[PDB]
Design a protein around this ligand. Structure first.
Ligand SMILES: CC(=O)N[C@@H]1[C@@H](O)[C@H](O[C@@H]2O[C@H](C(=O)O)[C@@H](O[C@H]3O[C@H](CO)[C@@H](O[C@@H]4OC(C(=O)O)=C[C@H](O)[C@H]4O)[C@H](O)[C@H]3NC(C)=O)[C@H](O)[C@H]2O)[C@@H](CO)O[C@H]1O
Ligand SMILES: CC(=O)N[C@@H]1[C@@H](O)[C@H](O[C@@H]2O[C@H](C(=O)O)[C@@H](O[C@H]3O[C@H](CO)[C@@H](O[C@@H]4OC(C(=O)O)=C[C@H](O)[C@H]4O)[C@H](O)[C@H]3NC(C)=O)[C@H](O)[C@H]2O)[C@@H](CO)O[C@H]1O
Ligand SMILES: [Zn+2]
Ligand SMILES: [Zn+2]
Lengths: 743, 743
């Protein structure tokens, strides 16, 4: 491998004194002949031969944005294949044709302003880098200088600038192609003649990008939502491949392999993915993570991810070369069916995804804390839950695009990215301000709507530059208190998550806690249920509290019982919530929605109608239920029990609130769940009563870790059970009677 | 109940303006008639009638120490029964007889200096308290003043002094009868006429005693060894009963109920208890915790503890009255047989006791970290292990008393209470001092022997006054890193404990870690095994490292195998330890022992031969094995595998050391166990190979909590398993092959 040296205060690999070193080294060159003859890889080579053809004037848009370049055609493809051919034959004149065909265009290329033009520019730099490195020994001394100058000229055009001192290192445009693929690629190629570019680009990557990613990688997830995952993660994977193939091995935390597992857990039976962050909706074509699946699966030799890639093994034209260079065509492939039904993502996330299966009958439930906010495409949705069953039931509302506009739309700023769009909690301080001066790249606004929701972190709702700035700022939004699933790893009866999300809100609250308990009921009539226990303490009793439940179609409210159904688009799922706390005498349950109220925010509706032929299921939503206390008080508690079944189901389980000693709980089906009445650690004896036939499965939470003793009807049932630290919980089986717990 | 009021800066209950309030209130008085007619409580009443008889001159010792008074006879018993009779009949002249019979003696009683005389003095005060309170309405005004004065005179004689400002509040004489029973009792009785005594005595209890006990109670154990448990804990239980019966409810952490469970777990099949702290040995009569079992069992209505009491329901004479007053004769009783085979005691202890059963064939293994030292009767034994099977095998060596002397003996100071007496670790710094100027009440010595062991905390090896001083001192000796047992709670295949005990030693070390893994092999030929993995980093490579294994009889050393047998006193157990690390080329294994070397400490043997007719089995020990590296180095590791079986078992389990990627481990029987090679958190992929037939049970420790993936032979075995925070472990079954773990 390469030598690692301290450059500008950081340990970094130095590009080896050898060519090629871009995307491969000498030793992989002889294998190109074999990859060429590989059946699997010859469609992709044929594709590249076809890309050599120039655009047809009748198809060339007037605005050539990133899509025009990413759909790479013509000269740049031709020179790349000459460079490749020179690699494989070393015929001097082939290397000459490559160099002479690209040099002049590289020097003079101009790019009219347009959507993400830096992507087109950067791709043009990559073509130059490929030739420079692959045909290096054919370069004349003057040609070397000309390339360098051209490379600098182009780099100055990028959003990150050159030096690359602009934008952000965890999110934003600089967390995409420009540094991790483009600048890096060129830096490596021209290092021997002009080391500055590498020193600067890789310097920022190693100092900032790598540090931030290695920080959250261990919890196997990403923070930009289910769409931005593609572009953002794809680029992490480019840096991974580029530096590895350069000879620096793997520079990322190996946990990087399992990040995409999240996308797998979130796949619906209808080809789409569970919502999260900036996303739009469609029902016309399945959603794919092709490139990340290719790069991650082929590097880490992961069959689950390769299965993901193989669903649609069709890369964007500009990435075809990298599939040809890097794809592992001998790697096996695995359906997700044998994967455990729940997966936990820890700090700084605190996320649980829980399923009842892997097919068309599976319930898919998401529960989130959010210890930190990464902003950009992430939403202020700490504490949010989302449930899908034969259709989206408890939904993550709003849409990224629509009639309102794009990223900068009032809809994004005032609803979509805000708490009120999610199944979370609102405490309304009428005098609270929400500074948004830093949000977006244009059409800025000083303040966003007051939604009674969570803070906008950063300098006017704008992401920090790096982890350094992030940790020193106000981006902490929560603290994971407890978590766990069991008793079986494979098919857990329950999935538990608790967070303190006080830090997500302003000083308008003193304490905001949420405990999720999802139940896999192992039952046909009623496959699943979710229990949500909330403690909210406002600094002013007069700050109105809201508990939100979003849906597509209009909910039915009958007393304490809310029914949500899917009846469209082939969806037939149903959701029924029993409101337990506050009690009947202190509970107001209302629904807001329909046209003019689908995106309602204390006065104003932030209209965002679907663009033509998009979101045919209206998953952006139209309705929400609001539960609010009748009486103004500082401290309040929410207790809600959601059941999930087919919409034709008439008889669900009856729910009982359990009132015991120091505990409040729920009993439905054959399950019992308890929480501390004040949602604090129970460090003293407590107890409650159970009435009902058969055997029940108990989950007791909020318990001081250590040895507990369980008595029933005055007699010892379990002489000693252990509550553990990660969940602070007890699980056991038992029948009806009066229970006592000793600690 | 009573009113709680804040006296001298603490919240504390005020004695009610009513009599009686000592040991009972009006409402329990009518029940005394029933208790009198209770069959179970008649023998105890008859006993008390017999105690009324005075000593016979031919039996009165010339030194009347605490035993002379605790074996209470004569006048004081008579007046107590007259007070009791007055309670039950309210015949004015009975109350008068009680008062007039005791008043003189109380005023003039003198006590010649002798062993723990404060115990006799305090008992005399209790008799006065009983009369004063129970016969209060018969007291003349001048008699009240006389009592008060007499009570003060007597209280000034106590070791704690009066005011009770002397000695210690977590250990020592002041953690016995004098405050928690005696001063407290008198204070309550005379509160209306002289509240100072209660204010002062209860003051210290509530400010100091209670705070310290409530601090460690939650982990259900005690810190003074298996003998001092009686007197020390009994007195905690007196304060419990006295304040409760006064009307203040339970002032202790309810965790108090389960402390004695420890004694139950440590009971051998021969009637004795596993060693720990200051203890002596006998094989003539079973060991009992009668009084603690009585008070704790009857107060908390615990059948397990009542069973303990009923084994020998024979209370010391001076405690007969309290059995009559407080014993629950209707309470049920339980053998320990249904109790889980392992029990964990957390902070500030970090102790695991693990068994294979509850009868004559049970192995009993103890594993200790020690996060703090309480001194007094506790030993400097952080990291120590002890194993019993059909006899004491890996022993806790030395003896409390013997030819050397008592508490102050050179044997106690230089061996018994020191690391070298235990199965732990030594790092010999030849220039280290061990200050002992504060140890003991007499015959003080400035310095104790250098045993290469653990520090002597406190001001010259003397306990702190209270928790306040303790936490601010140098009494921290360890940190629990991980713990756990499973997979089944009832009959765990493994019991795991890991601690960093660096703080137990001086700066002569940088790092000292010990991981215990006990295996219940569920096997007739070889019931159990213990694996011990040690990391030791010295500040000077030249500081000789020792790994200790103590035994009664002479060990056999054959290469890397050490065999220890019991062949005496009906004991037939055997221990075989396979030394894995250091390896053969860096391992020295020697034994020291026999006469002149049984208590050997780098130059000197601290002889302590048994007193006549004591320790028939010589459990004080005679031998130890020392394992030391051949080469001087700063960092060293010990890996030792102990198997346990009958001394007739000829063939044991073959032991294999597992050398893998980032991990070291053990394979024996059907068990696989691994540790981080540096005993650090493994946060990267790791692997190793397993060769052998059949299914194996795996326990991988030192892992980063999160989702792990297990492959073998290059294929997915387990797609996702969860290592939890408390144990940092993975557990699963598998057959032979090449294993790889991903995180
Ligand atoms: C740090 C920070 O907050 N930065 C903000 C920028 O993020 C933001 O820039 C806008 O970012 C969006 C974006 O979604 O990333 C750009 O949208 C364009 O690129 C995306 C992703 O490639 C396109 O989206 C998708 O289309 C498809 C598809 O057609 O199949 C696949 C993906 O799943 C889907 O998400 C999107 O169509 C592009 N839109 C264009 C070209 O108009 C914006 O271009 C970009 O401006 C700025 C905005 O002001 O604010 C920063 O603060
Ligand atoms: C804070 C501190 O460190 N204080 C030190 C004192 O603890 C210490 O005082 C000595 O403490 C011992 C002790 O063991 O507690 C006293 O021993 C006497 O009392 C104990 C308990 O009642 C007797 O022990 C029991 O004997 C029997 C039995 O008779 O069947 C069974 C029990 O299992 C066993 O524990 C012990 O026998 C008593 N002594 C005698 C001679 O009979 C000492 O009297 C007491 O001095 C002092 C010592 O200098 O040092 C302080 O620093
Ligand atoms: Zn959202
Ligand atoms: Zn000891």
């Amino acid at each position: 491998d390469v030598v690692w040296k301290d450059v500008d205060g950081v340990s970094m690999p130095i590009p080896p004194k050898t060519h090629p070193r871009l995307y491969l080294r000498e030793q992989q060159v002889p294998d190109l002949k074999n990859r060429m003859n590989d059946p699997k890889l010859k469609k992709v080579w044929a594709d590249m031969i076809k890309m050599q053809e120039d655009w047809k004037p009748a198809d060339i848009p007037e605005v050539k944005d990133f899509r025009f370049y990413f759909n790479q055609k013509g000269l740049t493809v031709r020179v790349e294949l000459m460079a490749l051919n020179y690699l494989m034959t070393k015929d001097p004149k082939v290397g000459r044709e490559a160099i002479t065909s690209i040099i002049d265009t590289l020097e003079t290329a101009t790019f009219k302003p347009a959507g993400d033009i830096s992507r087109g520019i950067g791709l043009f730099m990559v073509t130059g880098a490929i030739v420079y490195d692959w045909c290096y020994d054919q370069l004349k001394p003057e040609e070397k200088t000309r390339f360098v100058k051209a490379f600098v000229r182009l780099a100055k055009m990028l959003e990150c600038g050159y030096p690359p001192v602009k934008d952000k290192s965890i999110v934003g445009a600089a967390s995409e192609w420009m540094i991790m693929r483009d600048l890096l690629s060129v830096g490596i190629a021209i290092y021997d003649e002009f080391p500055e570019m590498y020193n600067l680009a890789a310097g920022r990557f190693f100092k900032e990008h790598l540090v931030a990613r290695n920080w959250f990688y261990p919890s196997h997830n990403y923070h930009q939502g289910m769409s931005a995952l593609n572009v953002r993660f794809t680029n992490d994977l480019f840096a991974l491949w580029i530096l590895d193939r350069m000879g620096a091995g793997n520079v990322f935390n190996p946990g990087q392999q399992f990040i995409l597992y999240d996308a797998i857990y979130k796949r619906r039976p209808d080809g789409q993915i569970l919502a999260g962050g900036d996303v739009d909706y469609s029902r016309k074509k399945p959603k794919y993570y092709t490139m990340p699946a290719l790069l991650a699966g082929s590097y880490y030799k992961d069959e689950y991810l390769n299965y993901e890639f193989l669903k649609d093994p069709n890369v964007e034209p500009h990435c075809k070369l990298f599939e040809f260079l890097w794809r592992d065509t001998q790697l096996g492939s695995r359906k997700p069916d044998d994967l455990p039904l729940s997966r936990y993502s820890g700090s700084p996330f605190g996320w649980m995804i829980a399923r009842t299966g892997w097919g068309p009958e599976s319930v898919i439930a998401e529960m989130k804390v959010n210890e930190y906010s990464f902003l950009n495409h992430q939403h202020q949705d700490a504490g949010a839950f989302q449930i899908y069953y034969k259709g989206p039931l408890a939904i993550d509302a709003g849409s990224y695009t629509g009639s309102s506009g794009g990223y900068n739309s009032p809809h994004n700023k005032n609803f979509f990215k805000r708490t009120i769009a999610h199944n979370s909690l609102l405490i309304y301080d009428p005098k609270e301000t929400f500074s948004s001066s830093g949000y977006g790249g244009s059409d800025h606004t000083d303040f966003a709507a007051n939604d009674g929701g969570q803070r906008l972190p950063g300098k006017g709702w704008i992401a920090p530059r790096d982890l350094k700035e992030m940790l020193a700022g106000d981006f902490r939004t929560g603290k994971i208190l407890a978590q766990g699933f069991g008793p079986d790893n494979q098919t857990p009866d329950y999935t538990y998550l608790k967070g303190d999300i006080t830090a997500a809100y302003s000083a308008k609250v003193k304490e905001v806690k949420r405990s999720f308990l999802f139940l896999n009921l192992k039952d046909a009539k009623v496959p699943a249920a979710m229990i949500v226990f909330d403690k909210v303490v406002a600094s002013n009793p007069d700050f109105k509290k809201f508990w939100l439940l979003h849906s597509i179609e209009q909910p039915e409210i009958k007393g304490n019982q809310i029914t949500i159904k899917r009846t469209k688009n082939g969806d037939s799922g149903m959701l029924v919530n029993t409101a337990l706390l506050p009690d009947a005498a202190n509970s107001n349950i209302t629904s807001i929605g329909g046209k003019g109220k689908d995106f309602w925010v204390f006065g104003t509706n932030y209209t965002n109608d679907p663009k033509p032929g998009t979101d045919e299921a209206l998953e952006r939503g139209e309705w929400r239920v609001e539960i609010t206390p009748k009486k103004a008080a500082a401290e309040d508690y929410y207790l809600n029990v959601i059941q999930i079944a087919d919409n034709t189901q008439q008889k669900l389980h009856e729910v009982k609130r359990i009132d015991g000693d120091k505990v409040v709980g729920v009993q439905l089906a054959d399950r019992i769940v308890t929480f501390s009445k004040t949602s604090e650690t129970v460090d003293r004896p407590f107890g409650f009563s159970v009435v009902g036939k058969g055997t029940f499965k108990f989950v007791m939470t909020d318990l001081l870790p250590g040895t507990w003793q369980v008595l029933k009807d005055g007699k010892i049932l379990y002489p000693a059970l252990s509550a553990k630290g990660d969940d602070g919980a007890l699980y056991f089986e038992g029948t009806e009677g009066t229970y006592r717990f000793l600690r």
